[PDB]
Design a protein around this nucleic acid. Structure first.
Lengths: 80, 57, 227
RNA sequence: UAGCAAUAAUGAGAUUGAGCAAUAACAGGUCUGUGAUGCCCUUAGAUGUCCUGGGCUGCACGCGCGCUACAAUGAAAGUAUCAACGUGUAUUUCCUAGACCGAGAGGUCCGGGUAAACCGCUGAACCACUUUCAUGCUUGGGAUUGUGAACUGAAACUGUUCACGAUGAACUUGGAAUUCCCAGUAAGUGUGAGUCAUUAACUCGCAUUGAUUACGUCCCUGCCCUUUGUACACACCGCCCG
RNA sequence: CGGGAAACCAAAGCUUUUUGGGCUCCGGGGGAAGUAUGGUUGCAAAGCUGAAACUUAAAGGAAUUGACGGAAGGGCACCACCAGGAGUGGAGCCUGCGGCUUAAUUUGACUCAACACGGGAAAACUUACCAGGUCGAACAUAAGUGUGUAAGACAGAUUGAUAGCUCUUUCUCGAAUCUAUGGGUGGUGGUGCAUGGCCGUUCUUAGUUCGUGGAGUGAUUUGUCUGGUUAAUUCCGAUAAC
């Protein structure tokens, strides 16, 4: 544990995990069609000024890129 | 501390100084701290010559 | 080993420096005081060994509250019959030692040693039985016959090897656990060795030469002239 | 050898207030002045670093330094008029001029001063004069308290401050006790500066008004000097007896 | 020319260098104790005799320095009085401290020498506190298939706030440091009784250290003074150094 000077153990008792990351099998099974047609797996940003080849999985359909770490969230029906 | 600091006392008296004192304070690992003053000379401590003559670091 | 030669501030220190006398006993013969310590290390000092005895602290009660003077006892001695004690208190233990050596080199007194019943071969221990007091501690000294190694406490054991005496029996009355007053009580005995009128000294004598008057108008000069 | 009655003489018996301040030390205070610091401690479960808010402002009470007053030498609205110490903006956020708009708080638009130059003759506050209140716990006093108007801070509540109307608490001079001071001093009255985005009753300065009463003794309480007693020497907060 | 530990004493000396005129009495650390007990004297009170058990590392003598008190002497001070004046202690509020209170009332300082202190006038910050709550720091400097060793930032949730703080959904981190640390760099964490530096009083003062000296067995000691002199260790002086 840990020791302060005057008041110890205010007790939420402090198990700290920022991100778990004993999970997250990486999406390297990249769909490449028959050579030389290709496919974009798990649709990234349509304008590819960013890299963003990050392959977020099938969520409930609100898909976020990862190089831009949560911006450019795209499937989609977006706004006007 | 009683000899090698005592050697540098008149290592500086060769220039012709009027007087030097060296105050070394602290513990000698008898952890109650002590201090002995290595007085030799005619030293002012007060007045305008205190700003003028004596120099300390 | 001067290394800087010092001026004689006294009178007969100049005569020592002038070479007017080469006899340390000539000073002892007329009993005039060796006043400056630079006299005897001209006459003596060729590896003439001394050793400290006793440097225990001595305090004084003040307002804030107790400050210490370290008092030293040093003992210097010629192994051909001269002795001295140093008694000097100081601030700290370095100048307690060195300050008393000058006092040890000024209290230097000859030692009379002699025979008991057999006038054979390098006079050995003591001519008679002597004692001396200072503050309740008396020490009689007994002339021990030849090869009878020193019978005394360690405080006059280290002191009487420095005195030119072969061996001794001694019998020290008093509180001799005060290791400084023990040493000073021996010296009043040894200084009496040239104060006991043996029948070896019943002739008249050549009366002396008066080193003032014999060397008088050779000091009518006003100069501190050496060799 | 000190006729110190020469007050005289004289701007001046020092302008006389201050800064520095030995020896000796204290178990004085500070490890939460610091990249002075031992060791200790805890840091992938942070005490750090802070992410946000609260608290240090919580209040039956004790105690401390203060502020404002307990008024008719005053109080109230005008009318006369003098400071000094100084501070003053540069990714600017300060001193401020002069117009404008505002009951005021405060708003617009421009100007000076990096300063003996501009605020600034720093033409401050009681004190001065005239009227209004007649010495009523009354307009003395402004505690308390409702609503509005504002300001800075992104953001303002047992509150961040500032005015406007309203409320008008105690207090009619403070028991036992206990402070500070001998002259431009006390005391009265302001202003600058400090921290300051905003908020001084605080302290560091400064000017102004300007008395009383000594002009000295050891009583009081301390501090020195010796002489003297001591069985005390973590020292009379001692030691210590049944 | 004595003697003694000294105080001191023509005896307390002649107790040389363990000495010697003769005679007599008494002591052998401190207590327990001049008690118990026996004997003896006494009208009694009590007197002359007089132990041990057990306990104890000191009791004691003469002197020295401080302590500097119904100890006398000589002096000094508005943090001391006399003579005065002004305020506090009364009330109101401001603020500090104690207490209680709460999760915290952070906390450091307690006669002067703590208590409008820490230049702490605290809205957050400060802040060390509290409650939620992030974020990586340096000798285990890393063995381990980067499918994660440490975050920037969607909606539902959550939170102080889509803060991806965290999580459902799940991409994304860049070993250019989680070493799974030696009980650690850091830390406003511990102890100022480990300390440095700083200061605070001590201490309104006048005091303090010498080198050599005529002065003690020695701690120590006219030197650093009885002046009948001064804010002052200040002096024409007694002078017993300069």
């Amino acid at each position: 544990a840990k020791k302060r000077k005057k008041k110890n153990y205010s007790t939420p008792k402090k198990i700290k995990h920022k991100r778990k990351k004993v999970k997250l099998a990486v999406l390297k099974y990249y769909k490449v069609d028959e050579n030389g047609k290709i496919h974009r797996l798990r649709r990234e940003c349509p304008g590819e000024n960013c890299g963003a080849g990050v392959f977020m999985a099938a969520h409930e359909d609100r898909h976020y890129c990862g190089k831009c770490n949560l911006t450019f969230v795209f499937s989609k029906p977006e706004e006007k | 501390v009683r000899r090698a600091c005592y050697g540098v006392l008149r290592y500086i008296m060769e220039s012709g100084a009027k007087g030097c004192e060296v105050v070394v304070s602290g513990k000698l690992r008898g952890q109650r701290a002590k201090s002995m003053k290595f007085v030799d000379g005619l030293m002012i401590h007060s007045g305008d010559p205190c700003n003028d003559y004596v120099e300390t670091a | 080993e001067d290394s800087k030669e010092w001026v004689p501030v006294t009178k007969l220190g100049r005569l020592v420096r002038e070479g007017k006398i080469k006899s340390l006993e000539e000073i002892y013969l007329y009993s005039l005081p060796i006043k400056e310590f630079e006299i005897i290390d001209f006459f003596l000092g060729s590896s003439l060994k001394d050793e400290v005895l006793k440097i225990m602290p001595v305090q004084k009660q003040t307002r804030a509250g107790q400050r210490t003077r370290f008092k030293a006892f040093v003992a210097i001695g010629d192994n051909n019959g001269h002795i001295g004690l140093g008694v000097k208190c100081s601030k700290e233990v370095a100048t307690a030692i060195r300050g008393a050596i000058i006092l040890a080199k000024l209290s230097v007194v000859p030692v009379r040693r002699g025979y008991w019943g057999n006038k054979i071969g390098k006079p050995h221990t003591v001519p008679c039985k002597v004692t001396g007091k200072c503050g309740s501690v008396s020490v009689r000294l007994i002339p021990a016959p030849r090869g009878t190694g020193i019978v005394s406490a360690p405080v006059p054991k280290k002191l009487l090897t420095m005195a030119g005496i072969e061996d001794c029996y001694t019998s020290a009355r008093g509180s001799t656990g005060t290791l400084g007053n023990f040493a000073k009580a021996t010296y009043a005995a040894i200084a009496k060795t040239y104060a006991y009128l043996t029948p070896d000294l019943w002739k008249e004598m050549p009366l002396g030469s008066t080193p003032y008057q014999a060397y008088s108008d050779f000091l009518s000069k006003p100069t501190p002239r050496l060799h």
